[PDB]
Amino acid sequence: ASAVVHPGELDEYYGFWSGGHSGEVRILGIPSMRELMRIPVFNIDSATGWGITNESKRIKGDSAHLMTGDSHHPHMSMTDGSYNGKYVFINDKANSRVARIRCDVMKTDKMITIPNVQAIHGLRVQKVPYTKYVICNGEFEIPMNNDGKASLEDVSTYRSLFNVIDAEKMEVAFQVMVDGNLDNTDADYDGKYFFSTCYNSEMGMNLGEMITAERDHVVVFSLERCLAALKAGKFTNYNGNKVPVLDGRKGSDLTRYIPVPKSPHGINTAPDGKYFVANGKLSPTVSVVEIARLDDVFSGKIQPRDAIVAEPELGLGPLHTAFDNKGNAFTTLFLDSQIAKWNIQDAIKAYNGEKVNYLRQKLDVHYQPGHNHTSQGETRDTDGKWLVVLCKFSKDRFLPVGPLRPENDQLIDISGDEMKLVHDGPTFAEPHDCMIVHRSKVKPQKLWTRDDPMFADTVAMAKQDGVTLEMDNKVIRDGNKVRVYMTSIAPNFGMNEFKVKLGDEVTVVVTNLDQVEDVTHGFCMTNHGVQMEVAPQATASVTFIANKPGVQWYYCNWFCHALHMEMRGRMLVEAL
Amino acid sequence: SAVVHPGELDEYYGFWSGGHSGEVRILGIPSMRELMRIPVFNIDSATGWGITNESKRIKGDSAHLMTGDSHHPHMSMTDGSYNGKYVFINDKANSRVARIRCDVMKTDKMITIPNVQAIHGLRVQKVPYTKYVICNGEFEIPMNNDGKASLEDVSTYRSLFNVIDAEKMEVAFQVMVDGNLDNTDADYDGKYFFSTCYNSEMGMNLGEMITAERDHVVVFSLERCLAALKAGKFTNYNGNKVPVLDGRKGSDLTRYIPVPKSPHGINTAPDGKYFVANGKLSPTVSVVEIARLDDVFSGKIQPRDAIVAEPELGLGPLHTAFDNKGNAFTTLFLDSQIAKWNIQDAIKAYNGEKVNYLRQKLDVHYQPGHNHTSQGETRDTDGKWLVVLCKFSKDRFLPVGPLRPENDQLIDISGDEMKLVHDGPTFAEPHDCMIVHRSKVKPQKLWTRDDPMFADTVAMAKQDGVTLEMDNKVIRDGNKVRVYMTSIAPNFGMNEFKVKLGDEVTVVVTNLDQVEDVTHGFCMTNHGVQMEVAPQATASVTFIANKPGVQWYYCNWFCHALHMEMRGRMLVEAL
Ligand SMILES: [Ca+2]
Ligand SMILES: [Ca+2]
């Protein structure tokens, strides 16, 4: 289509982007490819104070002390295989966390550390009947009792686990121990199966060992059999936690292993729910599995390789596949630096021995593509309009900026069934993955509400102090703790000064009482490394030590009003 | 045209304030795409800036701060033209100034400015080159801010103007003033600097800060300040050695020009002939003829005689940029417009001639703060592009919840009518930006082993007998362990190493690839530790091995087809 969005025109879709090594999630407008917002997740965000405010530290829980992460796969909750706009889930590979973003407020509301695992890589959502579960893979291999004693160097004890999270509760429902490691994951359109690639079926501890096998596998998980095993008590608990771990190693009836060449990476469900495609990586192929054959693999009527219905050669380094609404597939070729457009039914005919061309087109991309994604492509609403390709090396595509270069997110018009590159988008910190949802499916709110759970503990603290946040400007003294409750209505804080003793632990609680959307305030204590966003009708709080004597100005750092520079007051720190 | 198609390059670099995010951003102009984020005052998960030992060294006395608010990014000049060497940037929130090296596009120096609170305006000396960087303390505090008798005694409170030696990155001197300070600029002669003041009242609340019908612009004579310093006419405060000069009203070092009303921006015209101070609460700007300043200093004329026009423009004038034709573009925050006006016509109208100085008002969306033209703060001003930094985007973009982006609007000014061409959503309210032609900036492609940015790490390795270009070694030092490893994609030079529970582990990684932008990373899983390791760079991080058992480290950057396999084990032995 046209990719130009002129002033006063709106984008058609939201993109929820991996922030990659930055630890954030980004909202893009499609097709303009402009970044509309950054949602802080695993990072310490100076702009909003996410990671330093008390409300955000509470959400981070057991990981509040961590300052970094690597945001991998962002995916939105579905009802009957269509996006429902409620949540976006995102994993941190670096510290094995999963977080949930509420789309009403576009902030992270839950975060959990997955036990018993190291490195959560693939993450997707259950599609059908709705996102009951979020699925994600432990990529690295570690002992279940990883205590630094006899298991430390004993590779025969090392395991990777597949993780099934209750999406609404944001708690791990169960884990499945597998043979090999795990890489990417996806779900069917029936609510019956989940499936993951494995690159280290060898359980190798160095690169050479991890690339010896001509075929690793896709492991398929039967949800029905897993739930039955759980109900029958056929699980183990490890590490003093209560997460049930099921045994899905070879020999189990919970899982089946389909051999796939070679150290495969992406695994992608076709939007008709008929097939999934596993991407060959070191083999110049993709492997196509017919989902309707999985029951026969589980019953032992056919062998796991009998579920493969095509295995077309495409090119060098296939990593990831996306789909249009017409039966075609778009596969990234990392080493050839192309997208291969191919037709699934023709690839099936060719696997059956028919002399038929399945390859439609190869498009040069710039350069070294990882994942690629189509508009609404992971749902039944796939529309065949846009393809976005996440290229890892931008080389000559942008002005030079030094020894660290941006990545290149390339937008391709696939609407004419003939692919045309229309935009090179420089991006920071190597987004891994993204998703594209039509604007009609996402409806954020304009104002916070006073009962929001995200600052409910801070409200409860105020109530214990006898403070009404909507009304009060009060200083509560609790020994060497000081709790300062202030209102803000642009261009004024509700207190012009307050006094504390040197060394006091000061918690400032600010409530923005403006009632107009977009009138964001901030609170910054100068020279203390403290700043935070205070959104309309929100309460936010930060705790710091008053370890600097004398006059210490606080101010509203956000431009909320013509007189915002004058929206400041003094913390007066008395000497001992 | 503002379209940059695939395989075409932008014409200019923009160096953008990251606002409350604490970073600096590099944009392509006119595409308005963000090419890079340079970490400064923030803790950058992508690169490890703020957690690596190299970056904490650079941060010095502020390595413990996790936040900042990056204000005014400006590039060094030679004879009033950008020279591409440095970009300087202030942190208002914690009173710091940092320097970015443009060869590697990383921050190389950072200092906390003493005796002050809240650095707002920052600009560079233009002529004969950027010898000095100039910046303002916005808030008013005692010089002996000890929490004793001065605490509530407002008569002790002061703001200081700060002159930094750009090449040394040390404060050269400070000038104490009456009133506070807001924005600043420099002439094109190397004679004068000048700052706005909104709190000439020394008010401690909003009402008190807006009582005066005129506050002022304070003009600093560089020659007189240098002479006073050499004569020993300075004081030191707070046990530091920064010389503070007395520029209060009546000093020979400064002159105070009355300007209505709580003014904000102050902007030098590209011919060096005028500066414009922006009226804010007064619907005017005040135009000063720079050549009159010597006569203000000698007493031949009085300070208000420096003003040659004070045209009414509209409600809330905040900031002025210039084309290459004698026109000015002033943001009107309250009217939500840009006013295009002609300086010489405004002077004629001030002198009673029946001439219209207002060329056009363009609606912007919405509530503009600063605005900037392409090469506009230099002699190379080309009159092609104007960017306007609007604070409220309202309905301009798809809705994203209670926090909305700002709107950076690109306007084609190359013809007689201003034409809006692009709305750019931006994060965290950029305060200010600059636009430099691509030909003036020439970054390098690879680091070199002698770079000062990791020299202390190299010197540590040398004390251990380690040659970083060759060695994969573990050094044991009591409860400290130093691990030196090479990386050549797709392999680290070690597949595993052993430590004891509770050891303080420093991992030093040197990337030996010789191809541009084959970036590696090092991440210690579940430890909150990750960093960029650029080609030919060394990077290091220190953490406690407080988790027993197998702890995988991996290359988080996609450096090779086999990057997922580029990983090894830290084996943490139980006690
Ligand atoms: Ca393998
Ligand atoms: Ca005033």
Least Cα separation, residue B227 to chain A (angstroms): 32
Instruction: Give dist(CA A487, CA A497) in Å, integer.
Output: 13
Q: Considering only alpha carbons, which residue of chain B is nearest residue A515?
A: B402
Give CA–CA dist B564/A186, Å, rounded: 19
Per the listing, tokens 């597998």 go with: A178
Q: Give the count of beta carbons closer than 10 Å to the beta carbon of residue A347.
A: 25
The separation between the first and the last C-alpha atoms of chain A, rounded to the nearest angstrom, is 69
Q: How far apart are CA B376 and CA A164, in angstroms?
A: 57
For residue A186, give both structure tokens: 């996806």
What are the backbone angles phi and psi of residue B546, rounded to the nearest 5°? Answer: -100, 10
Question: Distance between CA atoms of A486 and A483, rounded to whole angstroms?
Answer: 10
Query: Is the Cβ–Cβ distance between B475 and B414 less than 8 Å?
Result: no
> What domains does chain A contain, in order, with CATH numbers?
1-455 (2.130.10.10), 456-575 (2.60.40.420)
* Pick from B45, B94, B152: CB nearest A21: B45
Give the Å distances, CA to CA, from B431 to A210, A567, B369, B391. Answer: 50, 17, 8, 9
C-alpha B525/C-alpha B532 separation (Å) is 15
CB proximity B522 to A under 8 Å: no
Other C-beta atoms closer than 10 Å to the C-beta of B573 total 16
Interfacial A residues in 234-263 facing B (CB < 8 Å): 263
- CB neighbours of residue B491 within 10 Å: 19
Element (H, E) at B256: strand B254-259
Whole-number Å distance between alpha carbons of A131 and B48: 35
For residue A218, the CA-to-ligand 1 centroid distance in Å is 12
Structural tokens at position B64: 């413990």
Do the Cβ atoms of B127 and A536 come closer than 8 Å? no
Neighbours of A482 (CB within 10 A): 21
User: Count of CB contacts below 8 A, A vs B?
Assistant: 410
> For strand B406-412 and strand B385-390, is the pairing parallel, antiparallel, or unpaired?
antiparallel
Q: Do A400 and B93 touch (CB under 8 A)?
A: no
CA distance B287 to A216: 74
Q: What 3-state class would DSSP assign to A460?
A: helix
The Cα A475–Cα A247 span in angstroms is 56
The verdict on whether residue A448 carries a ligand-binding annotation is no
User: Residue B206: helix, strand or coil by DSSP?
Assistant: helix
Q: Is A421 on the interface with B (CB under 8 A)?
A: yes
Cα distance between residue B395 and residue A518, in whole Å: 10
CB of B545 within 8 Å of any CB in chain A?
A: no
Task: Report, in angstroms and rounded to the nearest whole number, the Rg of chain A calculated over CA atoms.
Answer: 26
Does residue B350 sit in helix, strand or coil? helix
Which two structure tokens, joined as six digits, stand for B440? 């003036």
Tokens for B204? 């401690």
B406 annotated to bind ligand: yes
Name the closest ligand to CA A262. 1
Q: Judged by CB atoms within 8 Å, which residues 202-221 of A form the interface with B? A: 205-207, 210-211
Q: Is B478 helix (H, G, I), strand (E, B) or coil?
A: coil
Chain B residues in contact with A445 (beta carbon < 8 A): 401-402
Q: Are the C-beta atoms of residues B25 and B437 closer than 8 Å to each other? A: no
Query: Which chain B residues contact residue A35 at CB under 8 A?
Result: 34, 405, 425, 427
Coil/strand/helix, residue A449: coil
Q: Which amino acid is it at B374? A: S
CA torsion sign for A366, A368, A370, A372 is positive
Interface contact flag, A403 B147, Cβ < 8 Å? no
Way the structure was solved: X-ray
Q: For the residues of B195-237, what is the DSSP string, one character each?
A: EEES-TT--SSHHHHT--S-EEEEEEEHHHHHHHHHTT--B--
The 10 Å CB-count burial string (b at 16+, else e) for A161-181 is: bbbbbebeebebbbbbbbbbb
The candidate with the shortest Cα–Cα distance to A89, out of A115, A81, B528, A97, is: A97
| Residue of A95, A112, A390, A404 to mutate, interface with B, max B Cβ within 10 Å | A404
- B contact residues 269-328, partner A, Cβ 8 Å cutoff: 280-281, 316
Q: Round to whole Å and give the CA distance between B450 and B443.
A: 17
The answer to whether residues A485 and A478 touch, using CB atoms and an 8 Å cutoff, is no
Q: Which of B190, B189, B246, B184 is nearest to B219 (CA)?
A: B184
CA distance B508 to A60: 29
Distance from C-alpha of B15 to C-alpha of B387, rounded to nearest angstrom: 12
Centre of ligand 2 from the C-alpha of residue B193, in Å? 21
d(CA A100, CA A102): 7
Residues of B in contact with A334 (CB under 8 A): 561
Task: Give how far the C-alpha of residue A30 lies from the chain's centroid of Cα atoms, to the nearest Å.
Answer: 19
Which value, in Å, is the radius of gyration of the alpha carbons in chain B? 26
Chain B residues with beta carbon closer than 8 angstroms to that of A527: 93-95, 117
CA torsion angle B230 B234 B236 B242 (round to 10): -50
Pairing state of beta strands B358-363 and B368-373? unpaired
| Closest Cβ opposite residue B525 in set A94, A147, A423 | A94
Q: Residue B92 and residue A193: Cα distance in Å, rounded?
A: 54
CB-based contacts of A107: which residues, under 8 Å, 6+ apart? Answer: A39, A50, A101, A454, B401
DSSP strand pairing (A267-269 vs A275-279): antiparallel
